[PDB]
Amino acid sequence: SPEEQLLFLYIIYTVGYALSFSALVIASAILLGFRHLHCTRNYIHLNLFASFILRALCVFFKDAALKWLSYQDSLACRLVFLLCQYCVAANYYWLLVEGVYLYTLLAFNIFEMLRIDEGLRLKIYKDTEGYYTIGIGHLLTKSPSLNAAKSELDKAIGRNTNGVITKDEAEKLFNQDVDAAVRGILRNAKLKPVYDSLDAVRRAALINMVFQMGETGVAGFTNSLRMLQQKRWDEAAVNLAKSRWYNQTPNRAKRVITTFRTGTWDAYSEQWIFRLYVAIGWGVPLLFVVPWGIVKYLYEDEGCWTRNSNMNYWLIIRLPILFACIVNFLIFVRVICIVVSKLKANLMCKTDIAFRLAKSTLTLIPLLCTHEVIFAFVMDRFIKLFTELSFTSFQGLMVAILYCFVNNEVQLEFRKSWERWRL
Ligand SMILES: CS(=O)(=O)c1cccc(NC(=O)N(Cc2ccc(C(=O)Nc3nnn[nH]3)cc2)c2ccc(C3CCCCC3)cc2)c1
């Protein structure tokens, strides 16, 4: 029947945005509601959900405003359709920073953590305690003798030091110290059980302390290392603040303790980086959606700009979205090479936030950007093509499921709050 076919496609489209809107408002309420979920990774998801919530709001408003000059001729419709096209562009750019963040998350490690904290030295320096340090936090001997410190370093590097040591020589000795730091942990009976229970991100936080203090020094935190193994982060966080290490070096401790508490690199992140993501997700769409709106209102103004068949005014909204998808598939290919490299080299497990985030972000890129690339320069079997409306409606639900409902961290917050109710 012609009426039943046109009516059935309306149901699967409206229940699509109904299930999406609901799940996205629930998912956003979960990320804001639970205190331990307030991290950069989840704030980026909230801005992505916001673009799918406002897209659904345009869909529900268009449907509601049909209830009584026709709606196609009204200026209010054109504003709703402009707001709709702004949300579509925002979906593809909040998906872009979603891929950008993932890539930067795979690149940051212990070698970049310690390079920020320990810094870099070109010449041998007599440190405040009495030790001679050089490169990236490489101590030699406490003996007050520069002549013996240079002869000690010469045996460690190979060639004659003289004093000045290049960038490549410091990085070579820095890899040795980190390898000497992990062997110390695994050789220690009080550090190996907590290290093997910690995730790759909080493992680096434990290595960072051994790199500054030593295997026998951090082993003294018998009260703190026990509650880290028992997965009690915040109880250990306030415990490490009441230590000799926190009053000695507070700025370094604040960054290491946050990594044990949160399990992310946010204490090594810059606040202007997130300002550059909000300028990409909401700002860049605003640069090509308003000129498209201006030229469609001043020239191709006909039924909420439905008759989109005239000139290049169609490319000034499809090429910037195509560009966002081309770069998303480039990031897609590169991240897959990084993840498979880090998994085979045993530098990553399938239980880390970087691999879990890769299982969701690398799913959505060819799920939201594949259509735009296949039908790149095509404007306009009809029953089989109308099935596109179901994937455009339930894609809001899919973003909510992959970035919240399947997340292992939110499942911990529900299981923890559930136990708090009983006890
Ligand atoms: C090589 S790879 O393995 O790196 C990889 C690369 C690209 C895509 C995927 N696709 C994928 O793994 N799936 C299933 C799945 C399994 C686990 C999670 C998850 O636990 N996510 C999470 N946890 N915490 N936070 N986020 C999420 C998803 C997938 C596959 C296909 C679909 C569509 C099929 C058609 C219909 C619509 C869905 C959905 C998910 C893995």
CA-based torsion, 332, 330, 386, 87: positive or negative: positive
Instruction: State which residues form the domain around 84.
Output: 2-108+270-422
CA dist., res. 232 & res. 219, Å (int): 18
Q: Among 250, 268, 286, where does a domain finish? A: 268
Instruction: Among 106, 360, 403, 413, say which to mutate for ligand 1: greatest number of ligand atoms within 8 Å of CB.
Output: 360
Report the CATH number that the domain containing residue 187 is assigned in CATH: 1.10.530.40
CA dist., res. 129 & res. 179, Å (int): 24
CA dist., res. 371 & res. 364, Å (int): 12
| Contacting residues for 356 by C-beta, under 8 A, at least 6 apart | 407, 408
For residue 358, which atom of ligand 1 is closest to its CA? Answer: 4
Nearest to 316 by CA among 294, 291, 297: 291
The Cα-based distances of 366 to 45, 357, 408 in angstroms read 18, 15, 23
363 lines ligand 1 (CB under 6 A): yes
CA dist., res. 36 & res. 39, Å (int): 8
Let me know whether 290 and 415 are in one domain.
yes
Contact of 329 with 365, CB cutoff 8 Å? yes
Instruction: Among 359, 360, 365, say which to mutate for ligand 1: greatest number of ligand atoms within 8 Å of CB.
Output: 359
353 lines ligand 1 (CB under 6 A): no
Let me know whether 54 and 100 are in one domain.
yes
Let me know whether 245 and 383 are in one domain.
no
Let me know whether 119 and 256 are in one domain.
yes
Report the first-to-last Cα separation within the chain, whole angstroms: 59
348 lines ligand 1 (CB under 6 A): no
Q: Does the annotation place 239 within a ligand binding site?
A: yes
| Secondary structure in 3-state letters for 386-421 | CCHHHHHHCHHHHHHHHHHHCCHHHHHHHHHHHHHH
Q: Which two tokens stand for residue 390?
A: 């179901």
CA dist., res. 196 & res. 349, Å (int): 12
395 lines ligand 1 (CB under 6 A): no
For residue 339, which atom of ligand 1 is closest to its CA? Answer: 4
Q: Which residues are the active-site residues?
A: 118, 127
Number of domains in the chain: 2
Which strand (E) or helix (H) includes residue 8?
A: helix 2-33
Q: Does the annotation place 74 within a ligand binding site?
A: no
Let me know whether 261 and 277 are in one domain.
no
Report the CATH number that the domain containing residue 94 is assigned in CATH: 1.20.1070.10
Q: Among 234, 268, 302, where does a domain finish? A: 268
102 lines ligand 1 (CB under 6 A): no
Q: Which two tokens stand for residue 391?
A: 């994937």
Let me know whether 406 and 279 are in one domain.
yes
Dist. CA 362 → ligand 1 center (Å): 8
Farthest CA pair distance, the chain: 95
Dist. CA 359 → ligand 1 center (Å): 4
Dist. CA 360 → ligand 1 center (Å): 5
b/e string for 311-334 if b means 16 or more Cβ within 10 A? eebbebbbebbbebbeebbebbee
Count CB atoms within 10 A of the CB of residue 146. Answer: 12
Q: Does the annotation place 140 within a ligand binding site?
A: no
Going by alpha carbons, the residue nearest to atom 39 of ligand 1 is: 363
> DSSP per residue over 14-49, as a string?
HHHHHHHHHHHHHHHHHHHHSGGG-SHHHHHHHHHH
Going by alpha carbons, the residue nearest to atom 24 of ligand 1 is: 407
Let me know whether 91 and 124 are in one domain.
no
Let me know whether 101 and 231 are in one domain.
no
Q: Is 302 helix (H, G, I), strand (E, B) or coil?
A: coil
Nearest to 60 by CA among 49, 72, 52: 52
Dist. CA 339 → ligand 1 center (Å): 14
Q: Among 249, 268, 287, where does a domain finish? A: 268
Dist. CA 358 → ligand 1 center (Å): 8
